[PDB]
Design a protein around this ligand. Structure first.
Ligand SMILES: [Cl-]
Length: 283
């Protein structure tokens, strides 16, 4: 046989000394060239001694100083160890620059494609992170790695429908990271799983002020384009009104004094709408 053909994809996440969570990917069999026994990591605090760890996992958490660190990672099979994958963990006082330009993300062939403008400087590699935005879950990111030549690609892995992904592309140079650039996108959108709840702020005699709360990101199932307010009387006709997606209050005009009105709202995505709970009041 032979040792692993390739060095693993290699990246990190840091947040307060500071705690760094080194992470890597599992090399495919046709690159691992055999059963993977373990991985070897080393971290050299600038101008200090080399620290090392061997693990049979795909992550490593350590407490580092706010100094700089050079990281190395080698996956090991029976025949030997793969080439090392190098990282530079920038000193706390590091200033990143040179972001990507014209970042954009769009679904095509059931895959979520990301593309940007290839920068002037020469890039060593790209890092694409992405998590599902929710109000009942933190931003836990999946990720991948691309060569410095790439300027158009797709997120590798299992992506969900009706889920709003926050994608981040990060240039990587020998020096450290470039400035990140993010963007929100869906693999496939769909009618919201819930409609807005219309309630009366200020009830009047010849005019009513209605308010509602924006749909939590998880129930939208796609970018909300606009709302729609329906209302009628027990014996009247139903009137519909369009409302900008940014509005949280609307004022019904031309209302009859001492009357009962019935109201309900709808939320619309690029793929349809959803009604909310019916509501009633009286002038
Ligand atoms: Cl990868």
């Amino acid at each position: 046989e032979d040792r692993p053909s390739k060095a693993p994809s290699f990246w990190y996440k840091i947040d307060p000394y500071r705690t760094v969570q080194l992470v890597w990917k599992t090399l495919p069999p046709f690159e691992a060239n055999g059963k993977i026994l373990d991985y070897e990591v080393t971290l050299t605090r600038w101008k200090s001694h080399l620290q090392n760890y061997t693990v049979n996992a795909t992550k490593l958490t350590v407490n580092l100083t706010n100094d700089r660190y050079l990281a190395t990672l080698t996956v090991r099979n029976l025949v030997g160890k793969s080439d090392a994958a190098v990282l530079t963990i920038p000193a706390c006082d590091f200033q990143a620059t040179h972001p990507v330009m014209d970042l954009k993300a769009f679904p095509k062939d059931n895959m979520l494609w990301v593309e940007w403008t290839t920068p002037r400087e020469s890039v060593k590699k790209y890092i694409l992170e992405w998590c599902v935005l929710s109000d009942k879950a933190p931003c836990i990111t999946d990720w991948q790695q691309e060569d410095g030549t790439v300027h158009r690609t797709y997120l590798r892995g299992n992506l969900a429908e009706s889920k709003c992904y926050l994608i981040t592309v990060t240039p990587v140079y020998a020096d450290g990271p470039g400035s990140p650039e993010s963007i929100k996108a869906y693999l496939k959108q769909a009618p919201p799983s819930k409609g807005p709840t219309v309630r009366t702020k200020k009830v009047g005699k010849n005019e009513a002020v209605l308010e509602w709360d924006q749909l939590p990101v998880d129930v939208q199932n796609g970018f909300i384009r606009n709302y729609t307010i329906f209302y009628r009387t027990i014996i009247g006709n139903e009137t519909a009104v369009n409302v900008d997606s940014s509005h949280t209050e609307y004022t019904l005009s031309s209302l009859t004094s001492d009357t009962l009105y019935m109201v309900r709202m709808a939320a619309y995505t690029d793929e349809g709408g959803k009604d909310g709970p019916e509501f009633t009041f009286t002038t």
